[PDB]
Amino acid sequence: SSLLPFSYLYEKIINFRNTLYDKGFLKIKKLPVPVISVGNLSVGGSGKTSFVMYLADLLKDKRVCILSRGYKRKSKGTLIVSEYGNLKVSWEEAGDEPYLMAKLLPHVSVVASEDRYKGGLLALEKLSPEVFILDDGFQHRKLHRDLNILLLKKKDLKDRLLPAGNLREPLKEIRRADALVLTYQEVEPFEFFTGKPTFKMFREFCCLLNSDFEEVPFDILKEREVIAFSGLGDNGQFRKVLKNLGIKVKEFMSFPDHYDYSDFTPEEGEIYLTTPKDLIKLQGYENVFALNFKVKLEREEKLKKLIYRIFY
Ligand SMILES: [Cl-]
C-alpha cells in the first residue's frame, strides 16, 4: 500500500491523456490500409502473443505486417525485423517477442518501431502489406485502428492501476474496445458482458516446436524421458504445465530471466524442452524443443466477420 499514492496520481495523468484523445485534442493519425490493434489493460503476456499469431493466421490470404514496439531493443528508429517470414536481424537487435512472432509466422512481416505510424509507413514502402496488426497497441491512441481488440483475463477485473496493481489503464477504458477477447479460459474461466462482441479464448497443447521453429509431433517422446529448463523464473509456470502435461522429466534446470545461453552445453543424444523465448537462443541445437500451444476461440466465425468488414 506504500504504492497507492503513486496509483492515485498516475490515474489522473492517464485520465487526462485519455480525455485529450477522447475529445480530439490530440492528433490521431491514419495509415492508408486497414489496422487491427491487439492489446490489454495489464501488461501483455503469452496471451497477447498467442492471439496475435492466431489472428495473423486468420488473415493468411492477405499480406500481413505486424507492428511491434520493440521493447528491450537497442535504441530506437524503425526496424524491419522480418520480411514475410524471413528474419532480417538477430533476436538481440529486435527483442524476443518480435523475433519470436517473426519465427512463428513464416508468411508475415514484422516491423519494430516505437512510433507505430512511422513503422507502418516504412512497411508500406518496402513490404506493401494489405493489413497491419498492432502488437500491444491498445494504449497507442495516436494511431487510428479500424478494429480495436482488447484482451482481458479474469485477474484484470479485480486488479488496480500501476504501481499498486498491474492495470496500465482504469477498467472503464474498455469502452474503447470494438471486440473483447476473454483469455486464459483454460486456467481461469470467467464470463464478462459488455454488449460488445466478446470471444472466449482457450489455449490447448498442440505439438512441439523444434529449433528451426517448425512444428513436430510430441510423439517422439512417447517412450522417452526429458530434461527441461527455463530462465525468466517462469519455471514454476513451465514446471506446472510440464507437470500438468504428465511428461517424464529426468532432470530440471534453472537460469536467470535474461539468460543468453552464450555457453549452454547440452548432451548429444538427450532431449531438451525449454520455452520459445529461450529456444530463440538455442537454434542450431536439435534435441532442444519448446511446447507449442494453439488458440481455440469461441464464435470464431463472428470474429472473422468483424475482421473482414475492415477491408471495404
Ligand atoms: Cl496476455
UniProtKB/Swiss-Prot annotation:
Gene Ontology terms, MF aspect: ATP binding; tetraacyldisaccharide 4'-kinase activity
GO biological process: lipid A biosynthetic process; lipopolysaccharide core region biosynthetic process
EC number in record: 2.7.1.130
Keyword entries, A-Z: ATP-binding, Kinase, Lipid A biosynthesis, Lipid biosynthesis, Lipid metabolism, Nucleotide-binding, Transferase
Reactions catalysed, as given in the entry: a lipid A disaccharide + ATP = a lipid IVA + ADP + H(+)
Superkingdom of source: Bacteria
Cellular component terms (Gene Ontology): plasma membrane
InterPro entries: LpxK, P-loop_NTPase
Annotated signal peptide: none
Pathway the protein takes part in: Glycolipid biosynthesis; lipid IV(A) biosynthesis; lipid IV(A) from (3R)-3-hydroxytetradecanoyl-[acyl-carrier-protein] and UDP-N-acetyl-alpha-D-glucosamine: step 6/6
A Pfam family recorded for this sequence: LpxK
Binding residues annotated for ATP, in chain numbering: 42-49
Function: Transfers the gamma-phosphate of ATP to the 4'-position of a tetraacyldisaccharide 1-phosphate intermediate (termed DS-1-P) to form tetraacyldisaccharide 1,4'-bis-phosphate (lipid IVA).
Family indicated by similarity: Belongs to the LpxK family.
Protein name: Tetraacyldisaccharide 4'-kinase
